[PDB]
Amino acid sequence: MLDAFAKVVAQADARGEFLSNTQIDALLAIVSEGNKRLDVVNKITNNASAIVTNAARALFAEQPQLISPGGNAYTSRRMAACLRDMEIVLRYVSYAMIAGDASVLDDRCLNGLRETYQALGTPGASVAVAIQKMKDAALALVNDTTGTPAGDCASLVAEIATYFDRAAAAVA
C-alpha cells in the first residue's frame, strides 16, 4: 500500500531524482485540504451501518430474486456474507480516501473479486448495484452540515465518487 505521498517518492527513486518544486507544491495542496478530507472520512465512518443496511434493503427491494429460496442472498449465512462484503467495500473506499490513492483498494480487495463471485455463483451485477447505492448514500452524507464549517468539498466528492466506481467495476 502506498498513499499519495509515497507514490510520488517511489517514482522519483526509480529515476534517481529528488522531487521537483512542482511535485512538492502539488503535495502541499493535499495537506491544505487535509481537514476537509478527515471530515469526509469521519462522515462515512460515523454512518457506516446505516449506509450498508439502507443500501442492502434497497437492493433486495429491486432484485427480490436474491432473497427467494435458492437465491444467492437466501439463508442467514448467505445474507450475513453479502452484508459483510458491502461493509468491506465501504472500508476499503474509506482507506483509499484517507490515503489519497487507489492502491489499497485494488491490491487488498478487488484482486480476484470478479473471479470469486463467478466461481461461487454470486451475481456480479447485483454487487455492482449494491456499491452504486452505497456511493449515492455516502456522497449525500459527505455533503451534510452539522459540526462542520460550511464550504466546498466538490473535489473530494469527485474523488470519492471515483473510488466507488473502481470497486463497482471490479465485480463485472
Ligand X SMILES: *[C@@H](C)[C@H]1/C(=C/C2=NC(=C\c3[nH]c(C[C@H]4NC(=O)C(C=C)=C4C)c(C)c3CCC(=O)O)/C(CCC(=O)O)=C2C)NC(=O)[C@@H]1C
- Binding-site residues for (2R,3E)-phycoerythrobilin sit at 35, 39, 149-151, 153
Q: Which of 61, 69, 76, 77 binds its own copies (CB under 8 A)?
A: 69
Instruction: For residue 156, state whether it binds another protein (rule: CB under 8 A).
Output: no
Distance CA 156, CA 152 (A): 9
Which residues neighbour 172 within 8 Å (Cβ) at sequence distance 6 or greater?
Answer: 114, 117, 124, 125, 127, 128
Residue 70 binding result from ligand X, another protein, its own copies, none, given CB thresholds of 5 to 8 Å by partner type: its own copies
| Separation between Cα atoms, residue 60 and residue 79, nearest integer Å | 11
Nearer to another protein, 13 or 152 (CB): 13
Q: How far is the CB of 165 from ligand X (least distance, A)?
A: 19
Rounded distance, CA 157 to CA 143, Å?
8
Q: Which does 156 bind (CB under 5 to 8 A by kind): ligand X, another protein, its own copies, none?
A: ligand X
Would you state the cell numbers that stand for residue 38, as one nine-digit string?
A: 478527515
Q: Please report whether residue 11 would count as binding another protein according to CB under 8 A.
A: no
Please name the residues in contact with 117: beta carbons below 8 A apart, sequence gap of 6 or more. 123, 124, 127, 171, 172
Q: Looking only at residues 85 through 114 of this chain, which bind another protein when binding is defined by CB under 8 A?
A: 90-91, 94-95, 98-100, 104, 108
